[PDB]
């Protein structure tokens, strides 16, 4: 029914830096880990999916990020994009959120926020027009930061709904309907 871009945020860097947080998980680790389960969460109620990550040990800086992904995001006729992201703060932030560009983002935003809701605090969804990912992008974007990458709390949790169960919760936003 429709289809679908995923990308993964950040980057490792040819030097071997990884240009995500990093905490108790490192986020780049656990999206890259995420998105393909993600892509096969929609495709099972027949959606097409595209998951996008940023080559490994190619980039100089992480300016090459947005060079790489936004030529793609915007040459495969997506009606929705998805970025797939983990919050950080001092250790004592937790929950999750989502941020957006337009109105028909902020419908998607709520929803995947209420969902992960059920077993994070819901943050809320919050307007962003200051990120390329969303201001660069054609199709209507959302960029998730599905729990905090450096609270133990969050993590434990994630651990226990596992990929599958994070994405479920998302999909379930997405789609606006229960999978069960
Ligand atoms: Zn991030």
Same mark, same amino acid.
């Given at each position: 029914?429709?289809?679908?871009?995923?990308?993964?945020?950040?980057?490792?860097?040819? %030097?071997?830096?990884?240009?995500?947080?990093?905490?108790?998980? @490192?986020?780049?680790?656990?999206?890259? %880990?995420?998105?393909?389960?993600?892509?096969?969460?929609?495709?099972?109620?027949?959606?097409?999916?595209?998951?996008?990550?940023?080559?490994?040990?190619?980039?100089?800086?992480?300016?090459?990020?947005? %060079?790489?992904?936004?030529?793609?995001? @915007?040459?495969?006729?997506?009606?929705?994009?998805?970025?797939?992201?983990?919050?950080?703060?001092?250790?004592?932030?937790?929950?999750?959120?989502?941020?957006?560009?337009? @109105?028909?983002?902020?419908?998607?935003?709520?929803?995947?926020?209420?969902?992960?809701?059920?077993?994070?605090?819901?943050?809320?969804?919050?307007?962003?027009?200051?990120?390329?990912?969303?201001? %660069?992008?054609?199709?209507?974007?959302?960029?998730?930061?599905?729990?905090?990458?450096?609270?133990?709390?969050?993590?434990?949790?994630?651990?226990?709904?596992?990929?599958?169960?994070?994405?479920?919760?998302?999909?379930?936003?997405?789609?606006?309907?229960?999978?069960?």
């Amino acid at each position: 029914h429709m289809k679908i871009c995923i990308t993964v945020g950040h980057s490792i860097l040819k %030097s071997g830096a990884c240009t995500s947080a990093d905490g108790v998980v @490192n986020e780049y680790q656990y999206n890259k %880990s995420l998105a393909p389960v993600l892509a096969d969460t929609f495709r099972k109620e027949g959606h097409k999916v595209d998951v996008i990550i940023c080559p490994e040990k190619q980039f100089k800086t992480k300016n090459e990020e947005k %060079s790489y992904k936004i030529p793609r995001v @915007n040459s495969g006729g997506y009606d929705l994009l998805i970025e797939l992201h983990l919050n950080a703060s001092n250790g004592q932030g937790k929950g999750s959120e989502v941020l957006y560009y337009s @109105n028909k983002g902020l419908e998607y935003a709520t929803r995947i926020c209420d969902k992960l809701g059920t077993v994070f605090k819901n943050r809320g969804a919050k307007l962003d027009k200051r990120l390329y990912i969303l201001n %660069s992008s054609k199709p209507t974007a959302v960029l998730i930061e599905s729990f905090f990458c450096d609270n133990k709390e969050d993590y434990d949790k994630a651990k226990k709904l596992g990929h599958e169960g994070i994405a479920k919760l998302i999909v379930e936003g997405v789609l606006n309907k229960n999978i069960n």
